[PDB]
Design a protein around this ligand. Structure first.
Ligand SMILES: O=C(O)[C@H](Cc1c[nH]cn1)NC(=S)NCc1ccccc1
Length: 321
């Protein structure tokens, strides 16, 4: 089937996005960076390592649900079209495409991500593995281009891996409202959410003993050093995984070992790290079954299926517009 990529991101939109997030976030108390920047080439294959760690249960828990419920998803949503908010590269992507193809209604696949090069390779590989499917990849961001997602058909929107947990409630309700707004009656959303559980398990999931998560987090400093010509002593910064009991969310911080002076070249900015000062690089919100259904409701979607894995570690929601 035909491949198309629509690119709505200017060529240096990424680079200018980084300037805004670093100039702003390194200048608030406490210092904070958005998690969209972990995923250069190094971080991305670090993340790939994380998903295989025995400690990082989310990837396997959601895979387990999907291996068992993908057929029910296809049959319940009846979609002819898979819209992925994500790069389209996981095995879970195939499970859902297979479920729709098996039921005979897979006509189009819409991968939606910010890396046009990754959409390109996804689209070429799905074109090779799924004949008869139109691939319409959209390079854009959630903030602006949900409306550029193609129309015509019954669409199942897919947002897996508890990515929505990387958004704090305010940004989170506003995204789900935006998503419900581009959905048409009879379209549906499959949403993955990591569930609240024992904190010692949560912290271990974000601080594996061999420190792959530690590398992945520290990597954001290398990215900022390379792309904004800053001078972070990457090794003087410790990965710390914290469980915020009140906000019910995992927090990734970077602790400075002793006072640091960091000049961000490309920004004409110098920031001061107190010795032992911590910087928020990621939040990872954990959910309760009822609260997910209520957020979906708040956004104008009606949840019709909830699933957990065998252990109650992780949840998938299927909600309809
Ligand atoms: O909330 C989480 O567990 C993780 C972050 C995390 C895991 N371990 C330490 N940090 N975020 C995820 S899967 N985002 C989805 C994504 C995947 C690939 C490329 C871009 C975006």
């Amino acid at each position: 089937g035909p491949v198309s990529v629509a690119n709505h991101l200017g060529e240096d939109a990424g680079h200018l996005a980084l300037r805004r997030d670093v100039y702003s976030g390194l200048q608030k108390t406490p210092k904070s960076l958005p998690p969209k920047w972990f995923y250069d080439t190094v971080g991305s294959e670090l993340f790939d390592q994380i998903t295989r760690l025995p400690e990082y249960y989310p990837t396997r828990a959601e895979a387990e649900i999907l291996r068992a419920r993908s057929a029910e998803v296809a049959s319940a949503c009846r979609a002819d079209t898979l819209v992925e908010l994500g790069s389209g590269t996981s095995e879970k992507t195939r499970m859902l495409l297979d479920a729709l193809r098996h039921r005979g209604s897979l006509r189009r696949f819409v991968p939606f991500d910010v890396d046009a090069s990754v959409l390109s390779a996804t689209a070429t590989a799905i074109q090779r593995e799924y004949s008869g499917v139109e691939i319409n990849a959209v390079c854009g961001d959630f903030e602006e281009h949900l409306t550029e997602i193609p129309r015509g058909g019954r669409r199942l929107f897919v947002f897996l891996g508890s990515t929505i947990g990387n958004l704090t409630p305010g940004p989170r309700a506003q995204f789900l409202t935006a998503l419900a707004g581009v959905m048409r009656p009879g379209d549906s959303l499959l949403l993955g959410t990591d569930l609240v559980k024992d904190a010692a398990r949560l912290v271990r999931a974000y601080d594996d003993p061999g420190g792959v998560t530690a590398q992945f987090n520290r990597n954001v400093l290398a990215v900022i050093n390379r792309e904004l010509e800053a001078d972070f002593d990457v090794d003087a910064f410790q990965h710390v995984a914290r469980w915020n009991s009140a906000e019910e969310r995992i927090e990734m911080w970077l602790r400075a070992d002793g006072r640091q002076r960091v000049r961000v070249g490309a920004l004409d900015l110098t920031v001061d790290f107190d010795a032992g000062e911590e910087m928020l690089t990621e939040v990872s919100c954990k959910f309760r079954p009822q609260a997910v259904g209520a957020e979906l409701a708040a956004a104008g979607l009606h949840r019709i299926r909830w699933w957990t894995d065998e252990a109650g570690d992780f949840g998938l929601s299927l909600a309809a517009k």
